[PDB]
């Protein structure tokens, strides 16, 4: 399986530099998880960027990939709560943010690797999905 | 019943001006919900400011108040998403931000009044808790 961070799905839908690779990664893995909160964040950013029609693309995307939205349970939040002490952002530490916490949280509990774009998850303890 | 927001609990723990009244409202209704994501945001803010021991006080409060951490389901995220387009904190206007969405969604789906601190949730299609 895999978990999708918003950084990737926003990057894909906005057609950012590495888009097609993320699309291959997605295709390689049959089951694909996304935290209900990561879903939200994504919808917020796109529907601000491209308005509602952008939002309609997200829904098709989600239906096309057959993504499983997972609810944010307490244990996910607990995992994230601890992770932010170690890995969270600060003055010049370039680690996790509040949105990232829910992707981290879901990956840690599920035991599955995460698909993302940027530094935020580079130096963490969860597995990453390797791009082809 | 009530829904508790991050802005309230952080107020009640940092000993902000209104704290005492916020406690009274909590006592006035026995059944209390809080979204797992608002719990996280509270944990992050508290444990940043007062370290891990602040988190221990956060955990005692939740236990003592018998607060039910409700998981964020897709339905809550959908109403949050739509709401934000109307009541979002865009340029120049106060209103909901990413974090607020999680208590709004729980409040909107549960259909229960929300206890909060500040301007974000004021002009909005969900009920506020009356402050004694």
């Amino acid at each position: 399986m895999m978990v999708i961070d918003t950084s990737a799905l926003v990057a894909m839908l906005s057609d950012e530099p590495d888009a097609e690779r993320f699309e291959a990664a997605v295709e390689a893995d049959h089951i694909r998880l996304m935290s209900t909160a990561s879903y939200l964040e994504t919808a917020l950013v796109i529907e601000a960027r491209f308005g509602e029609p952008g939002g309609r693309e997200l829904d098709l995307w989600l239906h096309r990939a057959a993504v499983d939205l997972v609810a944010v349970h307490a244990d996910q939040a607990d995992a994230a709560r601890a992770a932010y002490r170690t890995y969270g952002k600060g003055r010049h530490r370039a680690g996790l943010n509040y949105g990232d916490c829910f992707s981290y949280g879901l990956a840690k509990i599920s035991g599955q690797p995460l698909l993302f774009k940027g530094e935020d998850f580079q130096h963490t303890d969860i597995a990453t999905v390797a791009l082809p | 019943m009530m829904v508790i927001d991050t802005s309230a609990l952080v107020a009640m723990l940092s000993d902000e001006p209104d704290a005492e009244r916020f406690e009274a409202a909590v006592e006035a209704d026995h059944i209390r919900l809080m979204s797992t994501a608002s719990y996280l945001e509270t944990a992050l803010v508290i444990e940043a400011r007062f370290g891990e021991p602040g988190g221990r006080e956060l955990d005692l409060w939740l236990h003592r108040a018998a607060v039910d951490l409700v998981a964020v389901h897709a339905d809550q995220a959908d109403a949050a998403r739509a709401a934000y387009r109307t009541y979002g904190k865009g340029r120049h206007r106060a209103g909901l931000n990413y974090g607020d969405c999680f208590s709004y969604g729980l409040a909107k789906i549960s259909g229960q009044p929300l206890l909060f601190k500040g301007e974000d949730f004021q002009h909005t299609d969900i009920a506020t808790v009356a402050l004694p």
């Binding site: 839908l13 699309e23 997605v26 295709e27 096309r64 | 931000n97 974090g99």
Partner: peptide, 30 residues
């Protein structure tokens, strides 16, 4: 019939919409 094609159609269609808001974060505030 392949999935990457279906997701690329959505990508291409979505990326070419008019940008009504240009700033990134602070749409996501905190």
């Amino acid at each position: 019939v392949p999935l990457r094609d279906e997701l690329a159609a959505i990508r291409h269609r979505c990326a070419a919409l008019p940008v009504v808001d240009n700033r990134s974060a602070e749409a996501i505030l905190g």
